[PDB]
């Protein structure tokens, strides 16, 4: 009988979402073992995002990931959890490489886009 | 050097995110016990919108929701996972209630203007 839509209640999810994530992994259930660091996650979020986590998860608390420097994989992370992507050209070739073997569509097209410009 | 905000992110976020749930329960770690009916989520989904599902996952794969109906209970999940409510006179002090008891600030908003229409 009456409708609603709520415009930022998307945003506001992925926020809390991510500020789970940064108090010390709050429902989080995968630690990312990149390098030295580690990184808490939702399987989730990982797999909403990325065809590859996606595909991994679907077919076990850490997973270790080999080929991703931590400082290339907390950008992408970032990305993920806030839908800010900051490209530093010092290791874009790492980032954009990392997105492809990701499978992260939104990132493969911002890596695209910064080539064009370069 | 170069910063990417994608719009369409938390969105589409969270449009995959109810896809796994529909899809039989995909990367979902609780079952909504609900009067004979079963709701497969995201313990992480409903705390960020639910201050009440945030407190008891804070402090287990099933949980039996004892004092809400499934059709109502039904509504309050579809908004979590896609921002949009449909809001019944039907039953529409039963919703109200409900989203008070979850504390789903977004839904006792809206809960509170259809008061204000009636």
Redesign the interface.
């Known amino acids: 009988?009456?409708?609603?839509?709520?415009?930022k209640?998307?945003?506001?999810?992925?926020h809390?979402?991510n500020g789970?994530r940064k108090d010390g992994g709050?429902?989080?259930?995968v630690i990312l073992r990149v390098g030295e660091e580690s990184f808490p996650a939702?399987?989730?979020?990982l797999?909403?995002?990325s065809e590859y986590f996606e595909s991994v998860?679907?077919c076990g608390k850490e997973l270790e990931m080999h080929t991703i420097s931590p400082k290339v994989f907390r950008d992408i992370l970032d990305?993920?959890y806030t839908?800010?992507?900051?490209?530093?050209?010092e290791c874009f070739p790492e980032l954009m490489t990392a997105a492809k073997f990701l499978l992260m569509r939104?990132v493969i097209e911002?890596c695209q886009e910064?080539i064009k410009?370069s």
Chains 1, 2 share one sequence.
Do not use: G, P, W
Request: charged residues 15%; proline residues 0%; contains cysteine.
């Open positions: 009988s009456y409708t609603y839509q709520v415009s209640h998307s945003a506001e999810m992925l809390n979402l789970q709050r429902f989080c259930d939702h399987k989730a979020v797999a909403a995002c998860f679907s990305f993920a839908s800010k992507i900051v490209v530093r050209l939104s911002i910064v410009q």
